[PDB]
Amino acid sequence: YYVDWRMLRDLKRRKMAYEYADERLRINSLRKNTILPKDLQEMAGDEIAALPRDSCPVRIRNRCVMTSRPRGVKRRWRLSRIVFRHLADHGLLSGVQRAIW
Amino acid sequence: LHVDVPKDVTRPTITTSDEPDTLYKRLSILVKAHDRAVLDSYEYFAVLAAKELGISIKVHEPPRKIERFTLLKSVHIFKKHRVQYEMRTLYRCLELKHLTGSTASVYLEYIQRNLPEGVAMEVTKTQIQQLPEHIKEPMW
Amino acid sequence: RKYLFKGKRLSIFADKAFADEPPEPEASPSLWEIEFAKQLASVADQPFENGFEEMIQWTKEGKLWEFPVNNEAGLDDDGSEFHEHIFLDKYLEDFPKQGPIRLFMELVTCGLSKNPYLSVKQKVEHIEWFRNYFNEKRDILKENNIAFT
Amino acid sequence: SPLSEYALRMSRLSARIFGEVARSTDSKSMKVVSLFSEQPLAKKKETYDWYPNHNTYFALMGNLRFLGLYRDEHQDFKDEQRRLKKLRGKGKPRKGEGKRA
Amino acid sequence: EEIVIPKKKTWDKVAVLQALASTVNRDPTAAPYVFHDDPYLIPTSALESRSFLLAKKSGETAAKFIINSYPKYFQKDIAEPHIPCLMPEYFEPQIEDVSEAALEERIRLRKVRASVDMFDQLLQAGTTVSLETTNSLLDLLCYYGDQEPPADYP
Amino acid sequence: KNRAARVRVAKGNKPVSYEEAHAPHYIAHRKGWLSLHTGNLDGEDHAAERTLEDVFLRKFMMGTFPGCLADQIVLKRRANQVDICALVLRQLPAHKFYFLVGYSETLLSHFYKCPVRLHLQTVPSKVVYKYI
Amino acid sequence: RPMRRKALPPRTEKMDTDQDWPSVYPTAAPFKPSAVPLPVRMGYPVKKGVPMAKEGNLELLKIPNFLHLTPVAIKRHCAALKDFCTEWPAALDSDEKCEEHFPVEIDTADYVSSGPSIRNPKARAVTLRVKLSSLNLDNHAKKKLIKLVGERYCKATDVLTITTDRCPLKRQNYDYAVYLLTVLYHESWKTEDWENSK
Ligand SMILES: [Mg+2]
Numbered sequence: 001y002y003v004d005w006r007m008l009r010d011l012k013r014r015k016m017a018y019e020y021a022d023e024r025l026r027i028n029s030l031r032k033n034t035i036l037p038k039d040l041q042e043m044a045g046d047e048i049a050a051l052p053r054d055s056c057p058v059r060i061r062n063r064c065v066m067t068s069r070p071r072g073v074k075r076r077w078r079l080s081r082i083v084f085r086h087l088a089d090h091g092l093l094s095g096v097q098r099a100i101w
Numbered sequence: 102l103h104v105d106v107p108k109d110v111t112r113p114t115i116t117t118s119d120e121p122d123t124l125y126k127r128l129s130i131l132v133k134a135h136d137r138a139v140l141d142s143y144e145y146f147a148v149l150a151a152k153e154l155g156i157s158i159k160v161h162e163p164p165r166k167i168e169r170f171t172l173l174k175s176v177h178i179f180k181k182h183r184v185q186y187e188m189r190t191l192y193r194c195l196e197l198k199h200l201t202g203s204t205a206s207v208y209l210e211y212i213q214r215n216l217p218e219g220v221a222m223e224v225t226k227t228q229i230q231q232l233p234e235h236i237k238e239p240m241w
Numbered sequence: 242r243k244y245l246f247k248g249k250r251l252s253i254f255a256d257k258a259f260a261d262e263p264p265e266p267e268a269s270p271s272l273w274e275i276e277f278a279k280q281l282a283s284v285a286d287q288p289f290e291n292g293f294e295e296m297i298q299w300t301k302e303g304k305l306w307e308f309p310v311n312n313e314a315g316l317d318d319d320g321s322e323f324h325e326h327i328f329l330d331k332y333l334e335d336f337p338k339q340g341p342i343r344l345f346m347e348l349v350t351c352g353l354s355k356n357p358y359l360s361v362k363q364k365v366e367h368i369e370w371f372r373n374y375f376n377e378k379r380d381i382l383k384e385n386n387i388a389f390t
Numbered sequence: 391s392p393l394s395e396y397a398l399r400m401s402r403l404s405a406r407i408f409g410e411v412a413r414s415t416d417s418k419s420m421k422v423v424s425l426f427s428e429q430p431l432a433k434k435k436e437t438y439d440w441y442p443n444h445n446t447y448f449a450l451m452g453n454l455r456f457l458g459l460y461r462d463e464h465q466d467f468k469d470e471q472r473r474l475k476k477l478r479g480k481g482k483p484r485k486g487e488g489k490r491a
Numbered sequence: 492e493e494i495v496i497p498k499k500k501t502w503d504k505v506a507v508l509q510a511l512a513s514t515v516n517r518d519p520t521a522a523p524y525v526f527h528d529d530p531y532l533i534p535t536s537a538l539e540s541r542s543f544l545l546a547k548k549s550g551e552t553a554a555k556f557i558i559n560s561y562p563k564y565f566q567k568d569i570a571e572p573h574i575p576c577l578m579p580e581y582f583e584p585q586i587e588d589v590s591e592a593a594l595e596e597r598i599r600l601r602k603v604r605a606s607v608d609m610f611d612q613l614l615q616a617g618t619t620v621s622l623e624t625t626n627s628l629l630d631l632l633c634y635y636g637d638q639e640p641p642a643d644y645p
Numbered sequence: 646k647n648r649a650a651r652v653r654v655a656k657g658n659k660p661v662s663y664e665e666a667h668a669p670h671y672i673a674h675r676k677g678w679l680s681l682h683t684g685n686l687d688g689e690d691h692a693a694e695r696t697l698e699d700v701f702l703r704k705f706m707m708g709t710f711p712g713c714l715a716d717q718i719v720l721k722r723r724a725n726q727v728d729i730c731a732l733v734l735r736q737l738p739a740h741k742f743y744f745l746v747g748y749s750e751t752l753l754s755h756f757y758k759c760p761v762r763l764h765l766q767t768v769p770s771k772v773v774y775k776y777i
Numbered sequence: 778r779p780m781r782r783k784a785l786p787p788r789t790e791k792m793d794t795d796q797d798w799p800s801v802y803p804t805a806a807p808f809k810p811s812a813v814p815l816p817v818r819m820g821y822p823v824k825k826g827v828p829m830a831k832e833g834n835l836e837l838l839k840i841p842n843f844l845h846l847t848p849v850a851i852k853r854h855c856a857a858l859k860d861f862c863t864e865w866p867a868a869l870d871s872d873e874k875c876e877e878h879f880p881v882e883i884d885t886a887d888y889v890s891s892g893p894s895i896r897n898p899k900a901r902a903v904t905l906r907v908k909l910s911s912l913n914l915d916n917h918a919k920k921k922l923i924k925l926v927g928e929r930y931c932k933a934t935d936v937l938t939i940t941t942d943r944c945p946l947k948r949q950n951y952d953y954a955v956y957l958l959t960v961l962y963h964e965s966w967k968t969e970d971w972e973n974s975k
Contacts, residue, residue: 002444011441017432025430026370032421035344037385040378057432065441065697072173078440078693081172088186089650089669092699094219095135095685097673099169099187102516102797110513113506115860122499122863126875126882133686135678139841146846153855154862166687189673190687199865203500207861210308210507211854213889215805217841218721218728219681221689222889224309229879232911235959239913239966272601272630288525292804293512295524297505302576304760306724307504310889312900315572318945323953326944327409347411348419352426354409357901357945358433367426396975404925407960409943442697443567450564451708459553459748461711494878497863510857514850515803520791521812528809530784531735531767532742539739546740550747558755569694570725570758571894577758663820664835675821677839683891691892716835722891723805730807730838739782759893764807767784772833775823 003068010061013054020055024048123202129225130195130209131163132216139217140193147195147212154208156197163192318360325361327354332368341387342375552643589613591620598627603639606631654777662716663774682722695722698757706731709749713737715771727757730764734771789814799850806845808837813844880911883954885947902942905954908935912962921972922965 002008030036030044053059062073064080072081079087088096130147134140144160151158169187173180200208209224216222270278289295299305307314329350336346349371353364375382375389382389393401405412411423431437454460475481483489503509522533526543534540558565562579570577582600586593589612597606610628613620652665667676684695699720706718710733719730733742746763753761792801792814801812810831819836820829831837869875884904888897909919909930922937923930929938941954 001448002441007441014438014440018438021430021432025425026367029349029422029425032425033345033348033419034416035341035348035419037341037382037387039381039385043378043381057430060437062440066700076692077696079696082176085172085184085649087696087700091664091672091676091679093685093696094678094680094682095188096186097189098670099185100670102519107516112513112857113502113509115500115502115506117498117500120499121496124496124879126872135686142843146843146851149848149851150855153852154859168687188685188687199869201497201499201863201865203861203863206309207507207858211858213308213310215846216723216889218723218891219683219841221683221686224887224889226885226887228883228885229875230881230883231879232881233955233959236912236962240963241967272634276634288523290517290524291512291515292806293508293515296804297508297512299760300505300508303572303574304576305726306895308507310887310895312888312895312897313946314895316896316946321949323944323949323956326949327953344413345422347413348415348422349426351409351411352423355423355427355943357943358429360945395971399971400924403964404927407925407957407964446564446567447701450561453561454557457557460708462708494866494868496866500861500863502861507858507861511854514799514853514857516797516800518800520788521801527742527746527765528812529765529767530787530811531782532739532765533785535785542740543743546743547747550744551751554748554751554755557752565755568758569893571896574758577755579755663829677836679839681841689890695892715833719835719838721807721841724891725893725895728807732833732835735782735784757893766809766833766838768833769784772829774820774829
């Protein structure tokens, strides 16, 4: 069991973007240039659109791995501000201390 | 042991090859840690080990780095109230000189295996070799 | 008196002028030979006597990293060479020798040469993909005055 | 200043040696070199392995609780609240037999 | 003028640890290393010595049982280089078709009764079996004397 | 008022340990860190993965030694080795501890693909820093 | 009726003051109050109190101790490790002497961190540094070599720096940097007809 249904949908989005990465790379290359005929570029613009929407990598959201919080996350640890503060304030993070200066 | 002592302890086999050895003009060892005292003890252990093996060593302290970030203290609203956290990184650089490749492997193995917890190393070997045989002679 | 190595011997056998004439692996290790070797190991099997002997055993089994640290230990990309990764124009022979397709594929092979995260086999698959793609679009290219294969 | 023939022909001689783009390429067409020289965002281990396998932990620890090798204070707490709730007659209805027919 | 470069010495991956091990000797005031270094956990008698080294082995067998019975939870590998000895073991044949190759797998896995069944089935069909493969079957049967290899399980 | 990791005053009858007595701002001043790895040092990677392993390793040790832990465990990573240092009460028989060490070591070595060792220091009872 | 086990007395009591301490702590271990024969105390003391004792001290357990590394052990260890080392050539007694016979400098970097994976992306990069004075270059070649390399050449130090990280492995990037030097040197000597129009 994952934290919630929102984390489950995101997990699937992350596994389908990995599957279609090479495909979306090879096809999208045909569009990001000025060297190929515009007829081919307009057609490659439609092959990329036909791929499933969950393959698109801009639909991935970074959520807290432990609470599935969408915002407030720190990317180095993948934890929300609330969860990070609980581990940090108890001496459980290696080298993290309070900042006094 | 007072009376019971090993007689002829078995020692590993070290076989000299026929390949020429690497020649390191310099070998910089940058250790990092959150704790200065650990760096002092590791510096003492490493400098003593180098002097005991005949290696030439010098030590300096690169400037420390402190990374600070701010967070929201409350779980809900109360924006103006924050909590700040920092991680401190301290450095000790062990600059070795004029090392063969056999001396640099045994020394690095010995000191890397004894690297305390919370300490990261960044070895920067600088090898010196002759010129390529093709480059030595211009050929058209 | 009872000299261990002075006196009469059986003499059924003769001095081994020829020694170990048949190779030790005359056949692939059988269950009988594979199991006898395991039993010889147990004869000298004693528990660890200190932390060194434990680390020695972990190293022999691959559990513990080898030292000095090598960040590329066991990491060989199919035994390739630098020239294989960098010079990739041999694979563009099927493509038109000149024209827009050549200009595009040149940019593709330039990026692939600067890609450290792909193997040569993976890089070839990217090139092969475009070869089949343009073949399928032969009719659209012909309208644009580009002839492919 | 402008690039004379000597300057331009030297620049092409350099690019040929250093494996750089040799022709005059627009800024738009230089993205193709970027796309195929950089690992895509969806192929980076941080993206596709952003989450821990929550199913493995929950299933493994649940199995260990049934083998007697792990004790889950939280689960024992919930198990007794269900037991007491069922005695009070507030238990979960059977599927298809809910209050609304 | 030409400099003479020394010839590089070489040694095994464990050679350095073996050198350091030679320096230290046994601690006379400590129990054998297997036993836990704590006054509460030090074996007082010879019975507690063997019992402590039989409860430890039992806990290792309890873990290996769980790992080999729920392998799907112990399949993610995050160790580079890859550690083969820390992966779940599989001992049951996964080749379903009845061929000389399938018999060879059972022989390799050392299953005695299953291999005999597939060998007899191969003879029933009459499919050719290599003399070398037929010998690998006899080796397993002759060595284990027609009885399944000894093992411990629930 | 700040409520984070502060064991609040009772009426002089609550036995707090050294670790519990000190609030978060005493970290790196009076009390150290329970986990020591290299993943939060500058220019180092895999902080997220080391932290997740720690969270699990603490929940695993509590359940595997239920009611037998006198204080929080200390995790020490060197190279790929993991070392768990736990203060454990002398409640269980001696032979039972040998079982849980063999089990918890093998299970966590096949789960994270590293050599894991458990270090247990047995106390007669919880050590009280002060009564608050 | 139930019997609670009694802990033995600490083994420090049986330790002589002239013992072989390296044997007590052969390798890195956590602090064991029952094995370290020292009355060490750690902890901020309460008012009218002394720092806490070693037994049951979490603070001492949280320390990365150096008991396994003592001046007596380090000297005994290095005595064994001497056979591994090889002797630096005496002739190369100066930095300038090395540049004479070994003008090419190859930089390789290793990284040691804690974790299950030994892989670091930064370990592939290689850097070659050679001085153009060390290379046999005619007046024409040196000008051609300096124009092709661009900013890789430093006029102040007269050092050409080639940084190669494009290839996946370090052995490939190293062989590539040596290759880049060979082509640049050989190309610089070659004279092209278009060069007469400078
Ligand atoms: Mg977004």
